[PDB]
Amino acid sequence: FLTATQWIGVNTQGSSLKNANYDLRADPIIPKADVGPWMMSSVDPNIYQKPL
Amino acid sequence: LQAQNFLTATQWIGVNTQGSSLKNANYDLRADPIIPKADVGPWMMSSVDPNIYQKPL
Amino acid sequence: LTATQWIGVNTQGSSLKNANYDLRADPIIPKADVGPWMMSSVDPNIYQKPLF
Amino acid sequence: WFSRDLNYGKANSKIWNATVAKGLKGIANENAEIRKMYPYLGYGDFTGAICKGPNNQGCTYYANYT
Amino acid sequence: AGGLSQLVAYGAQDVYLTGNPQITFFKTVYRRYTNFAIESIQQTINGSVGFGNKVSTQISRNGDLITDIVVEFVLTKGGNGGTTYYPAEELLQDVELEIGGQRIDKHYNDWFRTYDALFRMNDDRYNYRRMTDWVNNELVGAQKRFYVPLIFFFNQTPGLALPLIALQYHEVKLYFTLASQVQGVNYNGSSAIAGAAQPTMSVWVDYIFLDTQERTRFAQLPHEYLIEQLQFTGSETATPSATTQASQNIRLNFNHPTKYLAWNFNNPTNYGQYTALANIPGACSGAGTAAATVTTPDYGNTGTYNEQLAVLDSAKIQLNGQDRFATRKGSYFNKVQPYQSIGGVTPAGVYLYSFALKPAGRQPSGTCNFSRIDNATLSLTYKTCSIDATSPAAVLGNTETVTANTATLLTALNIYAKNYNVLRIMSGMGGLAYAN
Amino acid sequence: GGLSQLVAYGAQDVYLTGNPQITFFKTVYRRYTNFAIESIQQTINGSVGFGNKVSTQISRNGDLITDIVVEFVLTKGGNGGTTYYPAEELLQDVELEIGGQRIDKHYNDWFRTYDALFRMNDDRYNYRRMTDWVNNELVGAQKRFYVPLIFFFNQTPGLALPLIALQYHEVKLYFTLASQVQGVNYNGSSAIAGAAQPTMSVWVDYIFLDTQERTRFAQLPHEYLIEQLQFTGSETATPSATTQASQNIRLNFNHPTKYLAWNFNNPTNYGQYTALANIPGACSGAGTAAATVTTPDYGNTGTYNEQLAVLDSAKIQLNGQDRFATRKGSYFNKVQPYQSIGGVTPAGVYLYSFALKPAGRQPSGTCNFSRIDNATLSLTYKTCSIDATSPAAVLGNTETVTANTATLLTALNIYAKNYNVLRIMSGMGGLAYA
Amino acid sequence: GGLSQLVAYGAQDVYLTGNPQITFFKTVYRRYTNFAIESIQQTINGSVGFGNKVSTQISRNGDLITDIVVEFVLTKGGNGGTTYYPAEELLQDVELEIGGQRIDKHYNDWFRTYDALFRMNDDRYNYRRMTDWVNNELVGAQKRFYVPLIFFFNQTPGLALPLIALQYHEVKLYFTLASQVQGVNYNGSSAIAGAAQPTMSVWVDYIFLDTQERTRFAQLPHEYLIEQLQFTGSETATPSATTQASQNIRLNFNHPTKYLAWNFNNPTNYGQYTALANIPGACSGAGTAAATVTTPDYGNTGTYNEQLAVLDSAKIQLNGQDRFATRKGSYFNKVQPYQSIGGVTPAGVYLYSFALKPAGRQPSGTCNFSRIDNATLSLTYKTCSIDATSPAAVLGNTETVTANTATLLTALNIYAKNYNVLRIMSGMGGLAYA
Amino acid sequence: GAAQPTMSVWVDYIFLDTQERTRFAQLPHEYLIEQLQFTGSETATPSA
């Protein structure tokens, strides 16, 4: 009872496509830290689940 | 406290010539508490050189 | 009851005879009588934060 | 110096605080007296009444406590 | 699809708003409160009601606390619609509030008008007008009961209700002065109106009955209240002229932490006239036609928002010889101040300068303590009275620094200050903590 | 500058700024549970049309519900000035049933009375914009109207109805549509040939809760302190030209009442709370030869001219004893709402509060009529001696009289708004007191 | 009397007064930090005049800043009725920058849209008095106008910008002045010979704090919850006599959004959000032979007559999916602001809130567009078939149609107000989120 | 009858080999760049 987030379904996109990689080659991963107090980004890494 | 009663020697052994920046001001007559002049983030720094001769007690 | 004793002394007498019109707080010169003639009746301000 | 307001100020706060203590004892005593005079609670008809005996037994609405 | 798709769109940027949530908006738990009841009880007016007469009333001890007070009056129109302006407000010339023989406060008909101009608004203001004037184009002989609410601190919030219950030895009284003349009721400008009726008057006080536990607390313990008081100084306006910008420096004999100052210039002849008369619609009797006279107002439209008819060019407040703020135009004090501080609309000729962030409320929000300022001065610069009031082209097509030639009729200046003091009540008696 | 004020410090500042507790220059905002709101259309059963009764069950789309708006498309059956809040008139009543129990019920007249007392300024104007035609629209004009509901959960998020905690109880609304709506399908008593039947839609705003909050609602018991409207209609002791009428009306009320409200109306003309007269806006044709003081200017039905109101004075007695001194009708029309609400009330509508602040949700003193054996509202009427067709008589008259047309205000509507408790537990709910 | 109510106690009252927590008849006020407020004139760097761009640095003349008012002196280039909020039109845009980072930016149209949705009643009228000529002033008249800024720190002292805590950063306000202002230096497209250039001044209200509060601000880090305006201007799909245009507008927005707001307009005429027509106030000369439905009655540019509004209906989608059911434009114009703000919104201006109270400071539900990839505003327009020059057609028409002159409303302005956090640390600051 | 402009934005991209691809993504960088500051003024107008 009381379905929480599996009701509307999980969000497979999220905010990773705000700066999505357009190239076919996989982009290198960044550690995703918070280097500066201001301009803290809220964009997920967008890593390719299966490399070509 | 510590103020204008400090006479420092020059950085080089010769004739000196100093300048004055004073960018961001402090218009109010009350001397604002001196800020640290640190570096919290590495993106938007400022060349403000925090003012001296302004601290009550 | 005891109302006739505090009603006569409820009102406070905050006076400001000779105040400083400047912004800096004046030093506290303790009004101590040193002369028999021409004595003062100013009652100096004891409510004076420095702020400068 | 003369300090009219500190002398009158102190006299006032002295009376005031003494009077508060008296008044506080006063309200405490009245609440205690109500609880002792009417040491019970009411019943469905006399829902919020203050009662003198085990049953309603002529309970009132003019002496509330807790 | 639907609202869940938004809810689920959650991340780091939301943490400041909803992370480790503290509250909700969908579970209001109301605060439990004490038992009480409120009754409207008529007071007996001592003295003799009538125009120009003084009356007073002593508030009875029917309940434990008092708040709202409404003064009823019955007036009959001495002329047709358009001849009156807030006549019941005008009639209540003044009222003093006395507790235990000490004057606590005092309001004037002009204050009620000034206060209203600054602090009432929208439908509140209209409904107020409906209780003090004739606003449905009533005709001569029409009779109406008017209701003038008082605006003393205890008449605005229950939080400051006067504890008659804790004043067992002191009486609370209201002293009233009724105006000698009321426009459109017993006088028309300077002319008396034959056959005008004397007013009927009644003072109503709304009493609060507390339950036993709370009554006991009130009766036994001392109390202090943070209350409002109105200070007032009347003076002559440095009358402007077609040939000059008059200027004036008025030393304000004010005291106490002041929430705000307020003032107006007026023609004392015509209640509520804070602006010049002109031959433009609503600005004078008969304005817009051949019969227009710029010596008499359209009483029913005495107030206006047309600043061109106001007389203050600019002003500043100086404290102990130093400017408190840079000189600003009269329109700053008329339009901007209340925009920022009140949220209402102030008519031309009425000005406000607040020391408070929110002067319309009860909670102190910044004050100027004039009991510590030897010389508080209001410095005024007036507009040049060169505009021919009978000519709309001149009246309406003019500049910032000028006004109507008829603006020189606004010879009276009323400066008000509202401050905070402490009313102390103990063992059946009470009075104010600070003398000045 | 400002510093000249800070330096002006003394003994009288201590009670305002000494040992300071707060600031004004930094606001602490509270963190709140995550939620979202969606407008979802309900399916309405029963034929929609004039005089018909229709209903809907609120779908379990979200967890909590608040605002409800009934949309109605009406077509003008005549020109501007022929209608008066026609969408409000159309929605004759709305009944709220939870789990089979009646919880509350509103009436078109209540919506008008409620509005007259509690809405104001632009809030009121916009309300009018959503229920009437206010830009001189002409015959044939079609408009969608929105009638917000005024049930306790439709007024504040604080009382959002927990459909989530009502897993086994349905929530239903029954809407009765008026048999006739002025200026839409009828003009006075005359039907308007070709008039369209209304189109209706009911919208409910659903609140979606996050996991933690949603869980608490579904599992824990709740006690929602809610408002209810009590209402009965009465026959009016209407005025006569020669005698002054008076009437003792038993108040069949119960529960801790925030306030009473009432009005005197002509049941023929929706919203007419005053006598008609030949003065601008007070009757059809006022100001000209055609002025008829038996037919209102519908678009201007409401007025503030108390001279046309019928009530002279009133008091409320509890168990035969005066609750408060008798006051004039204008006291209940102007002062009561001045003091308790802050808006402006139209002539013919009266309020008496038992509460310190009845306009808010927070209880602030009530009159519990469940403990009053004999509560009565005692009303005295003005005499209806004034010739309504003669402005001089209409406008130049006295406090104790009104227009002869006041005799037509035969209906009296007395309302009481009170508190009750809606208890929800284990998926079911209902009221603590009946 | 009152006692008869007081004793009328039963079970129904327990929920209101049992185990009492508060009273209403004794108020304790909070002591506050001593402070003073002063309005101080700033220096404008640059030439002020029509079409010029100038800026000011807010000099550190106190500790915190709140209200900012821009003064202008304008003259009338024509008679009453020729201008519409000209001081607002003049201030084309305002940009707030701290330490070089854009915090926010407002546009003259935003000020108009903001006002249309969030100001109300007398505050709105007074605002109009501070930006326009509302007492039938004539050509050549000169007046000082006051345009308040509406940045987060200009709305509440609670968000006062701590200049004292920003020693190392400047705070600057950039102001762009319109190249032309209607009724001041231009009449429609025509320049007005002899028009004066505006006088301009910027006034900032400073807070002077006591020593303890000033020290804490100067030394401690701060987090101010603030608002930002996102804005994109775009083409309105233009509707016509033969069709209902529709449009899918990608919403390139980010951050937790309180609400979206938008309007359609004729970019030529400032504040024109509706079609023009030959009905009173709806066009220059409306009501007479000279009426022209190509030029507005500028002084009466705004209107509440939805018949002249272009939008038929709309929905917002998130990630390509409907966020709520499609509602009529009139929902977004009248009901949304009724439900969430409480004022009245002019025709042609629309609101959709994600927040319970979009008009307040406290966050109350937001749409975080930084977590949404495909947000779209989907609009459907009315059929532009109504002959604007004929009141019978203008006023007697149907829900789905509008004026043929509605096709002049070719510009669409979509705004989004969101939260961000302004962080101040060690004398410097900037926005928490990019 | 004037036409509205057609518009398109083109960006020329550099595609790196493997070692540089990694180095650019992982290493911090400092690029010395130019900025344009700009302010408009009224010209004191000269006269005959």
Per-position DSSP letters for F104-143, written without gaps between them: EEEEHHHHHHHHHHH--HHHHHHHHHTTS--S---TT-EE
Q: Check if the beta carbon of residue G150 is closer than 8 Å to that of residue G70.
A: no
Non-local (6+) Cβ contacts of F63 within 8 A are: F162, F163, F164, F206, F207, F208, F209, F214, F217
Non-local (6+) Cβ contacts of G218 within 8 A are: B32, B33, B35, G63, G164, G165, G167
Q: Check if the beta carbon of residue G219 is closer than 8 Å to that of residue F29.
A: no
Residue of B nearest to C24 (CA): B30
Q: Check if the beta carbon of residue F305 is closer than 8 Å to that of residue E133.
A: no
What is the DSSP track for G249-283?
Answer: EE----SEEEEEEEEEE-TTSTT--S---SSTTSS
SS (H, E, C) E139-176: CCCCEEEEEEECCCHHHCCHHHCEEHHHCCCCCEEEEE
Flag whether residue B30 sits within 8 Å of chain C, measured between CB atoms. yes
Q: Check if the beta carbon of residue E143 is closer than 8 Å to that of residue F399.
A: yes
Find where tokens 């185990």 sit. Answer: G19
Q: Check if the beta carbon of residue F141 is closer than 8 Å to that of residue F75.
A: yes
Task: Label residue G345 exposed, middle or buried (CB < 10 Å: 0-12, 13-18, 19+).
Answer: buried
Residue of F nearest to G210 (CA): F6
Nearest-CA distance H14 → chain A (Å): 11
Q: Check if the beta carbon of residue E377 is closer than 8 Å to that of residue E249.
A: yes
Residue E236, helix vs strand vs coil: strand
Is C7 close to E430, i.e. CB distance below 8 A?
A: yes
Neighbours of H32 (CB within 10 A): 4
Task: Label residue A10 exposed, middle or buried (CB < 10 Å: 0-12, 13-18, 19+).
Answer: exposed
Q: How far apart are CA E25 and CA F361, in angstroms?
A: 14
Q: How far apart are CA G241 and CA G249, in angstroms?
A: 22
**Residues of chain A with C-beta less than 8 angstroms from the C-beta of H26:** 28, 30
Region for G358 from its dihedrals, namely left if φ exceeds 0, alpha if ψ lies in -120 to 50, beta otherwise: alpha
Q: How far apart are CA E129 and CA E123, in angstroms?
A: 10
Non-local (6+) Cβ contacts of H23 within 8 A are: none
The b/e string for F414-430 (b: 16+ C-beta within 10 A; e otherwise) is bbbbbbbbbebeeeebb
User: What H or E segment, with its residue span, contains residue E122?
Assistant: helix E122-130
The b/e string for E6-40 (b: 16+ C-beta within 10 A; e otherwise) is bbbbbebbbebbbeebeebbbbeebeebbbbbbbb
Residue G391, helix vs strand vs coil: helix
Task: Label residue H5 exposed, middle or buried (CB < 10 Å: 0-12, 13-18, 19+).
Answer: exposed
Q: How far apart are CA G114 and CA E128, in angstroms?
A: 30
Distance of CA G43 to the CA centre of its chain: 26
Tell me, yes or no, whether chains H and A touch by having 3 or more C-beta pairs under 8 A. Answer: yes
**Residues of chain D with C-beta less than 8 angstroms from the C-beta of G18:** 48
Nearest-CA distance F9 → chain C (Å): 6
**Residues of chain A with C-beta less than 8 angstroms from the C-beta of H21:** 25, 28
Helix axes E122-130, F121-129, angle to 10 degrees: 100
Q: How far apart are CA G277 and CA G391, in angstroms?
A: 8
Q: Check if the beta carbon of residue E87 is closer than 8 Å to that of residue E132.
A: yes
Q: Measure CA of the first residue to CA of the last residue in chain A; give whole Å.
A: 42
Non-local (6+) Cβ contacts of F365 within 8 A are: E33, E35, E36, E37, E38, F354, F355, F356
**Residues of chain F with C-beta less than 8 angstroms from the C-beta of E23:** 30-33
Beta partners for residue E73, in sequence order: E146, E201
**What one-letter code names the amino acid at F156?**
T
Neighbours of E135 (CB within 10 A): 17
Task: Label residue F318 exposed, middle or buried (CB < 10 Å: 0-12, 13-18, 19+).
Answer: buried
Nearest to residue G412, comparing CAs of G329, G290, G322? G329
Flag whether residue B33 sits within 8 Å of chain C, measured between CB atoms. no
- Within 25-44 of A, beta carbons closer than 8 Å to E belong to 40, 42
**What one-letter code names the amino acid at E123?**
D
Q: Please calculate the CA angle G341-G345-G350 and round it to the nearest 5 degrees.
A: 90
- Within 123-152 of G, beta carbons closer than 8 Å to E belong to 123, 125-127, 129-130, 134-144, 146, 148
Residue G392 DSSP code:
H
List Cα–Cα distances, F3 to C16, E324, G310, in angstroms.
Answer: 18, 8, 54
Beta partners for residue G107, in sequence order: G93
Q: How far apart are CA G345 and CA G339, in angstroms?
A: 12
Nearest-CA distance H17 → chain G (Å): 30
Q: Measure CA of the first residue to CA of the last residue in chain C; give whole Å.
A: 49
Flag whether residue B23 sits within 8 Å of chain F, measured between CB atoms. no
Region for B56 from its dihedrals, namely left if φ exceeds 0, alpha if ψ lies in -120 to 50, beta otherwise: alpha
Residue G137 DSSP code:
-
User: What H or E segment, with its residue span, contains residue D5?
Assistant: helix D4-37
Nearest to residue F299, comparing CAs of F278, F277, F274, F270? F270
Residue ranges of E strands in E54-194: 54-58, 65-76, 92-99, 102-108, 143-149, 162-163, 172-178, 187-188, 191-192
Optimal mutation site among H4, H39, H45, interface G, most CBs of chain G within 10 A:
H39
Neighbours of F84 (CB within 10 A): 26
Q: How far apart are CA G318 and CA G366, in angstroms?
A: 13
Q: How far apart are CA E250 and CA E233, in angstroms?
A: 10
Nearest to residue F308, comparing CAs of F333, F342, F340? F333
Residue E434, helix vs strand vs coil: strand
Residue F25, helix vs strand vs coil: coil
Q: How far apart are CA C13 and CA C9, in angstroms?
A: 10
List Cα–Cα distances, G334 to E28, F146, F182, F199, in angstroms.
Answer: 27, 9, 23, 19
Q: How far apart are CA F190 and CA F81, in angstroms?
A: 16
Q: Check if the beta carbon of residue E73 is closer than 8 Å to that of residue E199.
A: yes
Tokens of F335: 């002062």
Is G11 close to D47, i.e. CB distance below 8 A?
A: yes
Helices within G281-390 (DSSP H only): 329-330, 336-340
Q: Check if the beta carbon of residue G217 is closer than 8 Å to that of residue G165.
A: yes
Residue of E nearest to A3 (CA): E4
The sign one gets for the Cα dihedral E283, E288, E294, E299 is negative
Nearest to residue F35, comparing CAs of G351, E12, G368? G368
Tokens of F53: 């009764």
What's the reported resolution, in angstroms, to a tenth?
3.5
Q: How far apart are CA F196 and CA F186, in angstroms?
A: 11
Residue D31, helix vs strand vs coil: helix
What is the total residue count of chain B? 57
Tokens of F374: 């004999």
Residue F308 DSSP code:
G
List Cα–Cα distances, G28 to E222, E364, F23, G24, G316, in angstroms.
Answer: 14, 11, 16, 10, 47
**Residues of chain B with C-beta less than 8 angstroms from the C-beta of F3:** 28-30
List Cα–Cα distances, F275 to E133, F82, F382, G264, in angstroms.
Answer: 21, 18, 11, 45
What is the total residue count of chain C? 52
Optimal mutation site among E377, E427, E432, interface C, most CBs of chain C within 10 A:
E427
Tokens of F202: 């009911």
Non-local (6+) Cβ contacts of F30 within 8 A are: E22, E23, G362
Which of F31, F212, F396 comes nearest E22 by C-beta?
F31
Which of G63, G426, G430 comes nearest B36 by C-beta?
G426
Q: How far apart are CA G99 and CA G429, in angstroms?
A: 7
Which of F7, F11, F13 comes nearest C51 by C-beta?
F7
Helices (H) and strands (E) in chain G, counts: 9, 24
Nearest to residue G398, comparing CAs of G384, G409, G408? G384
Helices within G132-252 (DSSP H only): 211-219
Nearest to residue G84, comparing CAs of G115, G56, G54, G61? G115
**Residues of chain C with C-beta less than 8 angstroms from the C-beta of G211:** 49-51
Q: Please calculate the CA angle H41-H44-H48 and round it to the nearest 5 degrees.
A: 150
Nearest-CA distance G202 → chain A (Å): 29
List Cα–Cα distances, F428 to E329, F163, F166, F425, G11, in angstroms.
Answer: 65, 10, 5, 5, 22
Residue of G nearest to H37 (CA): G100
User: What H or E segment, with its residue span, contains residue G103?
Assistant: strand G101-107
**What approach was used to elucidate this structure?**
cryo-EM
Could you give the dihedral angle defined by the CA atoms of residues F74, F78, F81 and F84, in that order, rounded to the nearest 10 degrees? -30
Flag whether residue G20 sits within 8 Å of chain D, measured between CB atoms. no
Residue G395, helix vs strand vs coil: helix
The b/e string for B27-52 (b: 16+ C-beta within 10 A; e otherwise) is ebebebbbbeeeebbeebebebeebe
Which residues from G are below 8 Å from B when comparing CB atoms? 59-63, 99-101, 164, 166-170, 208, 214-215, 218-219, 425-428, 430
Q: How far apart are CA F420 and CA E11, in angstroms?
A: 40
Q: How far apart are CA E10 and CA F228, in angstroms?
A: 38
Helix axes E212-220, D4-37, angle to 10 degrees: 150
Nearest to residue G317, comparing CAs of G258, G382, G264, G379? G379
Residue F385, helix vs strand vs coil: strand
Helices within F136-229 (DSSP H only): 211-219
Q: How far apart are CA G214 and CA C51, in angstroms?
A: 10
Q: Measure CA of the first residue to CA of the last residue in chain G; give whole Å.
A: 65
Residue G31, helix vs strand vs coil: coil
User: Kind of pairing, strands F64-75 and F199-209?
Assistant: antiparallel
The sign one gets for the Cα dihedral D55, D59, D65, D66 is positive
Helix axes E122-130, G121-131, angle to 10 degrees: 110
Find where tokens 């678009």 sit. Answer: F299
**Residues of chain A with C-beta less than 8 angstroms from the C-beta of G434:** 39-42
Tokens of E282: 């609503």
Could you give the dihedral angle defined by the CA atoms of residues G149, G150, G155 and G161, in that order, rounded to the nearest 10 degrees? -70
Helix axes F121-129, G121-131, angle to 10 degrees: 100
